[model samples]
Target chain A: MKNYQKMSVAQDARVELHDSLALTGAEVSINHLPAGAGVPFVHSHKQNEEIYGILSGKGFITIDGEKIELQAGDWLRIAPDGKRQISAASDSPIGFLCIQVKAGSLEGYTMTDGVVQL
Target chain B: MKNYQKMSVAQDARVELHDSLALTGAEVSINHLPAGAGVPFVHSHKQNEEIYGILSGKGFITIDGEKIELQAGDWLRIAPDGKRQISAASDSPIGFLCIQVKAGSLEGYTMTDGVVQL
Candidate 1:
């Protein structure tokens, strides 16, 4: 069996990868919002915190009532309970990646968890 | 205290967001490999699985002995036990993002987990 799975993601409005990739650790989504458009509603996760990475264009995100402007190369993280909404700038479409995982579950990472085999 | 955190990531050889972002659910890294160069060592996680998204250029990844060519828009998920190494193509530099979390820890996602607040 293959130890990894591969997929090519095109420019979709929203593409979720959990089911397609058989991922067990995280839920990832690629999202695109056209100019002046936005996710229709505000929502919050019950147990998952969300990390957003802006891929291109400009946008704005409202988290807990604070509006934050986002551009390419910007990254943001919202707590699981924070009510949030996102929208593209009035003149430019926005593209981004969102990763969600259980709150407070990470224990180790790059510097501590990785075992280098040289 | 703020309900969210934001940062601007510049192009670098490797930038780990776990520490800077105070992330508790995952470890995210932005990596860049110059032409003909590669990560200096092979590595694996004890309890975390890794998801890689190619941001730009071309590269290859060796996972559990299988070499796979990769390019922009490619997404790959590797199991925790898979021994892996990554390198850029001979003529082009590579930029990518890596997100890591505990293996088998994700329980909910987009459709089932997200509550529409419309």
Candidate 2:
């Protein structure tokens, strides 16, 4: 069986990869918002935390009623309970990558978990 | 306490965001490889699966000895036991985002886990 999967993301409003890639660890999405457009409603997760990386253009994310500006290279993390909404700037569309996983589930990372082979 | 944390990523070899953002669910990193450069060693995770998004430039990822070319808009996911190494093209630097979470830990995603509020 293939140990890895690869795909190219197309330009779309939202593309979720959990099912497409058969991902077992996290739900990943590439989201795009047109100028002046935004997610239709505020939302929150029951058991997952979300990490967002702004890839291009400009936008704003409102978390728990606080609005934070976002642009290319910006990274944001929201806890499971943080009510959130996001939108693109009036003149600039936004593209971002989002990853969601069960809250409090990570046990180790690169510095502590990765084993290197020469 | 803030329910969310936001920060701008710098142009560097690697920027790990787990500690910086106090991420509880996943470990995320922004990695850049200079032209003709690559990660120094092959690596694998014991219990975490990794998702990668190629943000810019061109590169290749060798997973379990299979090499796959990558460029902007490409996404790849590797199981915890997949041995992997990455490098940039001879003439182009590569920038990619990596997210790691415990293998088989995700329970629900946007379509099933998110609760919308009007």
Candidate 3:
């Protein structure tokens, strides 16, 4: 139960909610990316798959040399070994949620109630 | 990978991306809620924990008789068995990302690059 209302943004465009909030099993954080800024390096995970949900703004996610455009209403899921980098457009600021988890540690996270009445 | 830009909004405020996208192990979807509307039911899950991230607008989540205010930058994680319902405020629209997973089934989803260079 952490709120980002008072969280400080790091120099790298991340709000650092994961460590600050102490989320367990799943590493969740909000990336408050500014226009033209991105993760400092291009990389891949050896054992974790990452899911990105665009919160606002426009950007492109480069996956092993393929550029995928990102915008509001888009969700991207990358496997553990996919080399990827995310960058926002110069004129459009962007923010996204990064959900990361290990290969066999998912627990109590996606079980549904059969039918959500809403 | 799913782009909600072309997806139709169900009358219930959800865009059916789970089935169309064919995601395995995890169920993910974006909710496009208008001002003053909300999920039609207040309920709880027996085996799943739900995390809701507010993408836009303002609203409140009632969890087991506790009302938690929500807005941009807020992430809500409700454990299994916690009764909950969502509602947007009269003056604001709200959309959220709901991530649901079963207990003891976490797989290569959270493993990291050891460290994200970004």
Candidate 4:
């Protein structure tokens, strides 16, 4: 009826939508990361493109080895198979909303696969 | 290359993804509502269901006239054709991440149309 999980629960943990709530075909996760830490690996989805919405703090994302700067309110869309890793800035904690859906199925849009403030 | 629109811009505006960034078939919006304000009308999409991800602050949502409380980290999924409106609490502004997709197509998940924590 309220709250799938608390913010404290997701602090330093990645909470996946499927495990926490419902509605799908697309998957989303909310993650909280403290300074100097982030996605453990530069991984990529085989068939799903991902959109990372920065909820707060400062960070940097590396896509295919190109480091992109990030700040609160920024969004980064990475294509399927694009290796990526995210990390917080030296002094700020970060919260992010990550949305992923299969490529070619999300029709009617342009692909801007980098930091775009929204 | 960065920031289609800044947070300052959306702070007083209702931002639609298709109109700002690019992604289609489904539409999402991020709204910044100050305390005591919200969706001007209780409306529903004819063929689209919506997911409202509470990003920050406090608020409440109404679906079919049933008022539900909300806070940061709360997510609510409303069915297509379900009339709804949103309002911020008297002292807190609200930032919401809203995602809408057509009905009967997003498969592989259960439908829990209410406040979900994630």
Candidate 5:
């Protein structure tokens, strides 16, 4: 079992992503967010399907253009591209986790560029 | 052993979460968030330690007023209310998951009201 606290997935040098762990594909990582702080964009990368579970608060998730609202005890998914989607923070930030199948270069959200940066 | 896309963890009735599954804890679900969709606010629960990963989308997470940004191939943690925190999605809906230790009460965040509603 990894002590998590000792890992940094989005923090540490150009690392605004991992709170303290790395997503080497496989396995799961628990992350937290404070009030009013989340991603800011509408970009997509192919090759990585996604999911979201709420530890608390209401999460708003969108896919292709459709939108869904998530509350505590909730979960959602971002299937292979799901047709280019995006997510935003609620009045309160979100407390959730992300699950994937070992970061295998699945084309991410939008495959127009085909950039190989993971 | 669940087929997902067939489960609802936070949506249905009084269910704004769970794209299609139930969080019985101890297990995980793959969820997705479209652009501009994600949780809102900064609330904490006492029994679950949440984890997050970016299936695609840059996430912004904050704890104890501290904020962190996330990108693809990243994972994070919400250590049992490490401090009242929250998360937000980027312009793109956050495609992630919410991992917990089963919905058990362990002080549960504020612990002031002790609201027996989950």
Candidate 6:
């Protein structure tokens, strides 16, 4: 790249689920959401550990059949292997940072195994 | 963990590099900074690729052989090994989130390796 510096990325205007921007590798960027919006269902992967950090608003986070309310400033490490994994936006709208880590991709990184609703 | 919910953590308020909070397994928690801080030197490892996100103030990020000024909302993916890994705070205090990929910690995560500052 040609030295990208000091840029403010805008948020996704409409609400949605997993509709955020991202990449298969590098860093996955999922920054957008509307109320009552969330990923369709809960599912986990074999080598990807997802972390959710609430930047703004509030909502419920589902992990393996467990559901908990989430507000701004909250963070979570979703387990792998099809564990209940999805974030539901609340009525007031929610904005959170999602980091999907790709495992076994040349670069070494570990994931915290097993996730709980809490 | 007794349903941990709704809590805002504080900053470290110290000046240093790689001194931020983190974990060997779970999500690393290294949130603190003063300024004029950075990692010791450039080095590379077998598998770990680190990503740095500027959270609070401004600073200079040196990845590999290049250096770039960073501000809040900026993000970078540092290459594996000692690829000039370090974030030095400017005259003002700087806050950033550092994620270290543990290669083979039972978590399968891929890293878009390589660092060129800017």
Top-scoring candidate (DockQ): 2
Instruction: Output the number of the lDDT-best candidate.
Output: 2
Question: Lowest lDDT 10-mer window, candidate 2 chain A?
Answer: A9-18
What is the per-residue lDDT of model 4 for residues B1-118, given as tens digits with 9 covering 90 to 100?
4312223223345676644455533556778788888766656655554567887788888776578888877766665556677899999998887766544454332133111221
Interface RMSD of each: 1.5, 1.3, 6.6, 11.1, 18.6, 12.8
Give a tens-digit lDDT track for model 1, residues B62-107.
Answer: 9887899999999999987788999999999999999999988887
Write the number of the candidate with greater lDDT, choosing between 1 and 3: 1
TM-score of chain B of 4: 0.75
Q: What is candidate 3's TM-score against the reference?
A: 0.74
Residue-level lDDT tens digits of model 2 in B1-118 = 8888889976564788999999998988888899999998999989999999888899899999999999988888899889999999999999988888999988978877898877
Task: Give per-residue CA lDDT, model 5, range B27-77, as digits (tens).
Answer: 353456566555444555344445554545665656556666666656565
For all candidates, state DockQ relative to the true structure.
0.74, 0.81, 0.29, 0.15, 0.06, 0.13
TM-score of 4: 0.74
Q: Which candidate model has the greater lDDT, 2 or 6?
A: 2
Model 3 lDDT per residue over A2-88, tens place: 221123233235654445544333567677568888877777777665667776678888876687888866776676657778899
Writing each residue's lDDT as its tens digit, candidate 6 over A21-98 gives 121233445465577777655555555555666667778776545777777656665534435544556566787665
Q: Name the runs in model 4 displaced over 4 angstroms.
A: A1-13, A106-118, B1-14, B24-26, B103-118
> Which scores greater on lDDT, model 1 or model 4?
1
Q: Write the per-residue lDDT of candidate 6 for residues B21-108, one digit (tens) a residue.
A: 1212224344545677765555554455445566667777664457777777666654444345455575776776665554333332
Question: Which wins on TM-score, candidate 2 or candidate 4?
Answer: 2
- RMSD of each predicted structure: 1.5, 1.5, 5.3, 8.5, 18.3, 10.1
- Once fitted onto the true fold, the runs of candidate 1 whose alpha carbons sit more than 4 angstroms away are B11-13, B116-118
Assess the local accuracy of residue B97 in candidate 1 as a C-alpha lDDT between 0 and 100.
Answer: 94
Instruction: Grade the docking of candidate 2.
Output: high
Q: Model 3: which docking level applies? A: acceptable
The TM-score between candidate 2 and the true structure equals 0.95
Candidate 5, residue A90: how far the Cα is off, in Å: 5.1
* Residue B93's lDDT in candidate 2: 94
Interface RMSD of 4: 11.1
Q: What is the lDDT of candidate 1?
A: 0.88
lDDT of 4 by residue, A1-118 (tens): 4312222233345677644455543556778789888867556655554567887788888776678888877765566556677899989888887776544454332133111222
Report per-candidate TM-score of chain A alone.
0.94, 0.93, 0.74, 0.76, 0.52, 0.63
